[PDB]
């Protein structure tokens, strides 16, 4: 079974579309498995506050690394192999292949940024690989880590270019390429490798 | 205010991670609006594809009476599609479709949707980025809330903040004297 850890301040955020289709039905058939941890519950103080203000000024908040220390050390504790990672926007981008590449491990971990982001020496003491899944500002890393999710469950064993048609046959004046309807398995391939060049 | 319109046989799924925090908030003072269509109420929506092929294809006569409908709420919607095929999604096409008051987001399920609807309703395709996903959904949620961000009112260097020790490991000590001028210096010298 591969394993997602998914360490965010919006722990109802999930499963959301991860639970829906394929996806949500190979979740309750176990053949993978979505860990979702929340951070607000490894903060231990007064108030419970999982963010500060940044050292040096500057505005926005920023994720405190004893609180995520803490969440981190627990996953870590539970499975001391996983592939620690973090959603950010100086990280690899994100690809079919990198997703591939991921898929070497069975147990992965995404950690979500919100606010202005975390505090760095999370980073470097972790070691967390960056990704990115493209050159756009989102919200918090949520988002992310389910497209990632999405990506890699798609190709576990057991869960899962040319223009398509189906019925009817006309829509507003508009005809199927008339190929496509005689059977002909040779013409129709034909028709399909010219349409997707 | 800033109107996204979703089309989606998973209605249920919004507005989800749209929901949260400052989207949330913004959505609920009416700073912007989010419709969400239920492909499924225009209708089966989806069918066996023409000449063979695995899986299935949402109609076109389906999809025409949801998009038709939307077209007869906002004539001057700006019709898209999330599609492997598309524009790369990067931040300035954000920008670029802020330029419209008004968008629509068909989210693709199955193997995809008849190409009579692509080619109608000229749809400006988009892509999130180069992997493959279950449906548009995620895609939809991407682009909205990178343009969201962007709406008035709504909302490189290393960071840190508090404790200032950490597993033996200590905040860069500029950072805690005050000195604006050796910060800013600091800031643009990690910035590569």
Same mark, same amino acid.
């Given at each position: 079974? &591969?394993?997602?850890?998914?360490?965010?301040?919006?722990? $109802? &955020?999930?499963?959301?579309?991860?639970?829906?289709?394929?996806?949500?039905?190979?979740?309750?058939?176990?053949?993978?498995?979505?860990?979702?941890?929340?951070? /607000? =519950?490894?903060?231990?103080?007064?108030?419970?506050?999982?963010?500060?203000?940044?050292? *040096? *000024?500057?505005?926005?908040?920023?994720? /405190?690394?004893?609180?995520?220390?803490?969440?981190?050390?627990?996953?870590?504790?539970?499975?001391?192999?996983? #592939?620690?990672?973090?959603?950010?926007?100086?990280?690899?981008?994100?690809?079919?292949?990198?997703?591939?590449?991921? &898929?070497?491990?069975?147990?992965?971990?995404?950690?979500?940024? %919100?606010?202005?982001?975390?505090?760095? %020496?999370?980073?470097?003491?972790?070691?967390?690989?960056?990704?990115?899944?493209?050159?756009?500002?989102?919200?918090?890393?949520?988002?992310?880590? &389910?497209?990632?999710?999405?990506?890699?469950? %798609?190709?576990? +064993?057991?869960?899962?270019?040319?223009? $398509?048609?189906?019925?009817?046959?006309?829509?507003?004046?508009?005809?199927? +390429?008339?190929?496509?309807?005689?059977?002909?398995?040779?013409?129709?391939? #034909?028709?399909? %490798?010219? =349409?997707?060049?």
């Amino acid at each position: 079974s &591969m394993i997602f850890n998914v360490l965010t301040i919006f722990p $109802q &955020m999930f499963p959301g579309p991860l639970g829906v289709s394929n996806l949500g039905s190979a979740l309750k058939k176990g053949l993978w498995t979505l860990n979702v941890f929340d951070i /607000r =519950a490894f903060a231990n103080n007064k108030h419970n506050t999982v963010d500060d203000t940044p050292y *040096g *000024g500057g505005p926005g908040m920023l994720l /405190r690394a004893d609180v995520l220390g803490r969440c981190i050390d627990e996953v870590l504790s539970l499975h001391p192999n996983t #592939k620690l990672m973090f959603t950010s926007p100086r990280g690899v981008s994100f690809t079919q292949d990198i997703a591939r590449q991921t &898929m070497n491990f069975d147990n992965i971990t995404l950690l979500c940024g %919100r606010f202005e982001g975390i505090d760095e %020496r999370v980073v470097d003491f972790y070691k967390l690989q960056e990704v990115s899944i493209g050159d756009y500002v989102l919200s918090g890393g949520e988002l992310a880590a &389910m497209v990632i999710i999405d990506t890699c469950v %798609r190709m576990v +064993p057991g869960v899962i270019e040319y223009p $398509q048609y189906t019925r009817p046959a006309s829509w507003k004046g508009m005809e199927v +390429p008339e190929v496509l309807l005689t059977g002909n398995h040779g013409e129709i391939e #034909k028709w399909r %490798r010219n =349409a997707s060049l």
